[PDB]
Design a protein around this ligand. Sequence first.
Ligand SMILES: CC[C@@H](C)[C@@H](NC(=O)[C@@H]1CCCCN1C)C(=O)N(C)[C@H](C[C@@H](OC(C)=O)c1nc(C(=O)N[C@@H](Cc2ccccc2)C[C@@H](C)C(=O)O)cs1)C(C)C
Ligand SMILES: Nc1nc2c(ncn2[C@@H]2O[C@H](COP(=O)(O)OP(=O)(O)OP(=O)(O)O)[C@@H](O)[C@H]2O)c(=O)[nH]1
Ligand SMILES: Nc1ncnc2c1ncn2[C@@H]1O[C@H](COP(=O)(O)OP(=O)(O)CP(=O)(O)O)[C@@H](O)[C@H]1O
Ligand SMILES: Nc1nc2c(ncn2[C@@H]2O[C@H](COP(=O)(O)OP(=O)(O)O)[C@@H](O)[C@H]2O)c(=O)[nH]1
Ligand SMILES: [Ca+2]
Ligand SMILES: [Mg+2]
Ligand SMILES: [Mg+2]
Lengths: 55, 348, 430, 439
Amino acid sequence: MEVIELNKCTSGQSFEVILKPPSRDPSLEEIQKKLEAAEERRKYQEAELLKHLAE
Amino acid sequence: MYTFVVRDENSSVYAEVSRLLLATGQWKRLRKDNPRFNLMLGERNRLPFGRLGHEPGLVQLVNYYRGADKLCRKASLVKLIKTSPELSESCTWFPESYVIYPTNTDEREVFLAAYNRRREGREGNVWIAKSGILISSEASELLDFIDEQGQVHVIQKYLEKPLLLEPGHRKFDIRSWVLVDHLYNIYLYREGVLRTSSEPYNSANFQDKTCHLTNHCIQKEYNYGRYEEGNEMFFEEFNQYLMDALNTTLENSILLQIKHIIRSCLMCIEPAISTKHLHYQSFQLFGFDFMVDEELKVWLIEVNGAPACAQKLYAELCQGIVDVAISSVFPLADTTSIFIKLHHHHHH
Amino acid sequence: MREIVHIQAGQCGNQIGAKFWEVISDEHGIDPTGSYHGDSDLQLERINVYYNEAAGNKYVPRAILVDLEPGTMDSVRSGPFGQIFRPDNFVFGQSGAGNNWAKGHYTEGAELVDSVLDVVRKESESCDCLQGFQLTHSLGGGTGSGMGTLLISKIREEYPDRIMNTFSVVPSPKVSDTVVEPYNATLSVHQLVENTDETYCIDNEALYDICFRTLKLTTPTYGDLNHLVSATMSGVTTCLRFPGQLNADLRKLAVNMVPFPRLHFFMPGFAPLTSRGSQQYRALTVPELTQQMFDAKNMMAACDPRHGRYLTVAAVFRGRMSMKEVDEQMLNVQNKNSSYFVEWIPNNVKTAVCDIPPRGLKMSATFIGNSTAIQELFKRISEQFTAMFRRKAFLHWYTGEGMDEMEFTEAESNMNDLVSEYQQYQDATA
Amino acid sequence: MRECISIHVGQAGVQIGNACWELYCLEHGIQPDGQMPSDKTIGGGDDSFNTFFSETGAGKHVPRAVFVDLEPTVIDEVRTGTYRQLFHPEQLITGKEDAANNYARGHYTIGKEIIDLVLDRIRKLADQCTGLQGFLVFHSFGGGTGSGFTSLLMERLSVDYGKKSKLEFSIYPAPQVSTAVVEPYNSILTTHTTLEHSDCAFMVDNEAIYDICRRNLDIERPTYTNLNRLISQIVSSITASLRFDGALNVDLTEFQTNLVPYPRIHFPLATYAPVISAEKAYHEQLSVAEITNACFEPANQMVKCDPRHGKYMACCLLYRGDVVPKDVNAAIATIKTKRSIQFVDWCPTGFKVGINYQPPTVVPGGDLAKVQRAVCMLSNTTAIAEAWARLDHKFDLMYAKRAFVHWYVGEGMEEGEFSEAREDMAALEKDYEEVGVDS
Ligand SMILES: CC[C@@H](C)[C@@H](NC(=O)[C@@H]1CCCCN1C)C(=O)N(C)[C@H](C[C@@H](OC(C)=O)c1nc(C(=O)N[C@@H](Cc2ccccc2)C[C@@H](C)C(=O)O)cs1)C(C)C
Ligand SMILES: Nc1nc2c(ncn2[C@@H]2O[C@H](COP(=O)(O)OP(=O)(O)OP(=O)(O)O)[C@@H](O)[C@H]2O)c(=O)[nH]1
Ligand SMILES: Nc1ncnc2c1ncn2[C@@H]1O[C@H](COP(=O)(O)OP(=O)(O)CP(=O)(O)O)[C@@H](O)[C@H]1O
Ligand SMILES: Nc1nc2c(ncn2[C@@H]2O[C@H](COP(=O)(O)OP(=O)(O)O)[C@@H](O)[C@H]2O)c(=O)[nH]1
Ligand SMILES: [Ca+2]
Ligand SMILES: [Mg+2]
Ligand SMILES: [Mg+2]
């Protein structure tokens, strides 16, 4: 029913039509910690494996 | 070999339908959570439509229409009739009705305004409430009953002058069963049922309700069974009564209006619920409940999205469902109609 | 690309291994001298997975040949493809293990294993990105079984983060009358459950029944059995050897196939089943391949698939055919049999097509299934094992090499636990 | 003129990236050698296409793109394909061994060891920028690199350029072309980690795209090349306003403003029409009313779901071709009387509209016919939560038996990261439901 913000150029145009109106991200430091806790867990699993195998 | 799962244990209707399908030899029942089915007989609540129609190489079909609740819940029905042009607040066949939330889009102001307008013509001022019912002539015995319950209510004009069967001065309601298949064909099962009251109708006594309320149960609990088995009259006998007592037919005096109400309801929501362009298809059985007044004018009371049948009628209907709802989509191996198909294209 | 090192151990391991090399060499147009002579470049794209490149444009299989006796190795040196293997890659002893797993694992195998490991090391070091290892051997003898599993344990120690893959031939009294094979097999399975990532179970009982009942061979030889083995091996390694999307390396394969670390034992399958020489005039249709490859009669492990459930399945179709049709036929198999596939691993069947068919066929299909019905094979070994072990029969051959009974009770227990883990998942619901 | 950096991660991200940049070169008249005859200022410019392309003194137009995969195969295609001279060696980043379909291995194990080199190469591109808007990131939900590495990158982008916008284009997994049974896991994991870091995310369900190709392009069995060509048309419609003169969605902030009121609910539904086979012998050109109407057909959406059962928060229409407003408005009036289009109570029921007069370019010898007008619609509707419910259920099925979990735990990841990611998704499904239904 109602056109607004009509903008035209050589490339084309744009506008808006209304029909009805209306009724803290991780620090570099934390990212490093969780990468490293992870690698600590990998390395521990693997060193346990190497233990059992030595047995 | 087609496959189906069963997710509503209670449904009398669908128990019978699996029975029929298994017994065909050409269907197999999988378990609940196996997604590799052609047919889901779904649960009544939070049915997972978002998960249907994402299994490559299976045409999938379910026995509910998503969005059909808008017809089947009492407050929803009222909003729907008030707000669709197609139906309007000038709908002649739905009781004047109002949505009333507790306080403990509300329409209490607008309601009272219409009630305190009807105290004036000093015309009958009986109203009824459900979501646990209450009929009363008093504005604030009703509003007082609702506020005293944490459930949302409909307050609807009560039909003071019903049509009474004889002998017995009895009230009734009519149940019609309607099957909408995946193409949005509307099918009225040719057998409906009257659910009769048993105690004489009381033009001025509202406490006792074996006489004001025609539920097959609330009648089993109080003279029950006297004039017909289980307080259920069928169309044969009721037609004869119309011929004998009123010189008319069920077809002409009542069924026409019923067909028009059914079609108007379902045509109204067809854009909202049709599965025509969808990755899964639906069908669904509805039960429409009607009141007839003493002028033989039909009124819609309610629509039930999970109706049960009447004992006598199970076998035939279920076979009908298998035939027009299911085998239309999944053909069986090879080599009367119980439904009236509702269609009307008037040109203007 | 990503290199695989192949080790073959013992008579069986070396027979089936040789046979694999012949077959995939021909699939890649590499001839007995190491010279390429084919007409596609699909053949060369992923050649480095299995072949090193020598100067002179020569391909040497990345393969190590091991046995405790000379026999099968003079025999392989002078097979058709014998001249293709690198010569310092033949590692052999002199006395043989006498069908004794203790000798293979602990006493004689002990002596030779450091020489094998040096050859393995040398082959590793010259790899750009090693994926890991694959071993062919039987479980019922002494070298493939006891030494082969000692190897696995040593390779795992030096390379704890590479994939270890075996082709393990399971013994059957239809093929062999040596009484202690259930002892060697149970001890071996114990090792396999701990130290491999995928194991393909090739069951001598299955191969023999296929040969007898289906291929109508009244007196099958090992050569007949091995013909089914090498078709299978070619089939299951297709995805590793050609360009493609699905299971294209060992680790991708293991993540698609192994939901729990212990249940890594697979039933391979194959269609069409054929006998050597005798001729294949009619190509199968995509619907025939599909029905046949899931047939119990086409499985290289004698398990009844209807007795269990598939946890995961990989399917490979070869030769030029309609991908559309492959797709319907695969969906059709799962939809028509949905209850054999666990509902709690959604979409657990994966399909590959490769354009190059195997020699002498316009088309085939290979199946790889992780089914709970594989418990049946372990149950059969376990019943044979327990009948002897409860009286300690034949044990003296094992304790005479220093083993203790306890070691036997442990192997038996680990295997009984394996069987019950499969049973637990056959009954799990969702 | 403010610049955008495009980051393509994984096989999916990289191959889709190729398709996009190819389409871009066709669109702007840039040749494979990187020369653009029609560009008048040699060695620079602050034109619109320069948001995506930098210039060298030799007159070469180079994508502000970085491709990273953890194995070399795919990126080696780029290094040596028809577009090989377009891209600077240092923009193409390969590892040796990939994440084996495992989010944990892509995030923790190989991620840990490559993030810095990737960040530094982007930093290189950011340094060539007068006023960087932010990032467009392309990746699958399902592979290990696309899920695990991407989420790690996003975390790090938020540290290093906290002020910047990040838009994602994410491939949602479909069994008919998936390569791994653990995609649902990877998908929930990457979504829980990236949710806070992404300003607006465009999901493309491979299944929707696969079916559109079968039905509309009459293709037997689509390959990635088919899917990617179709996906690139849609991406191109979405980014056209960054690359050409206009006044709608001209910066990345504006995508968020126009499409995302609620920052967690930032997954708009894309629908595109018409899709017409190049083989089609004869074809009647479809009117504005027709292609606009096709924008409400679930069969033309990038994610199958039913917007009739949900609420809209926002809705943009982006036309390419012969289209005037008088036609758009009349189309909208009709459509609205015919269809179920409910907005949430706190938004105007309306439409932002952008028309670019050039109709869509097609790759010559492609499957897509040249058309006079096309439309991509971008709506933010709560119906798209259907996709999360489908993924969540597959996750619950497998997780309850801990199937494959050991592969994740084995890379360092902890079993609690599973249930945490799952709970995040549960609260996200609650958000959509709260926003989109009353009864
Ligand atoms: C004296 C009886 C054995 C020959 C025989 N029987 C048995 O072992 C007993 C007999 C009574 C109780 C239950 N059964 C199990 C047998 O058929 N065996 C062991 C074969 C294996 C055997 O068969 C024959 C007929 O020679 C062998 N096959 C080969 C063989 O394939 N040798 C090839 C070379 C070769 C290959 C692999 C291993 C060794 C040698 C040579 C060529 C011609 C070929 O390829 O067919 C050698 S011994 C099958 C059960 C598999
Ligand atoms: N549309 C499209 N989808 C793709 C393409 N390549 C892969 N996919 C899908 O993305 C998921 C697989 O992810 P990939 O991108 O191949 O994985 P990756 O990021 O390379 O990670 P790795 O596990 O390291 O290989 C599956 O859902 C594939 O179907 C592509 O070119 N186009
Ligand atoms: N406006 C009205 N006028 C007269 N009677 C009415 C009425 N509304 C309801 N009733 C009576 O109440 C009975 C049941 O009410 P209603 O059907 O609305 O509740 P309900 O859904 O729990 C039982 P059912 O599902 O069988 O219809 C009807 O059979 C009818 O007799
Ligand atoms: N299928 C097959 N089975 C074999 C072959 N050679 C031996 N076997 C079986 O392998 C077991 C004995 O193992 P073998 O490899 O000979 O002993 P090893 O040299 O000590 O490893 C018995 O079950 C044999 O039947 C063969 O070439 N093919
Ligand atoms: Ca310029
Ligand atoms: Mg031997
Ligand atoms: Mg990859």
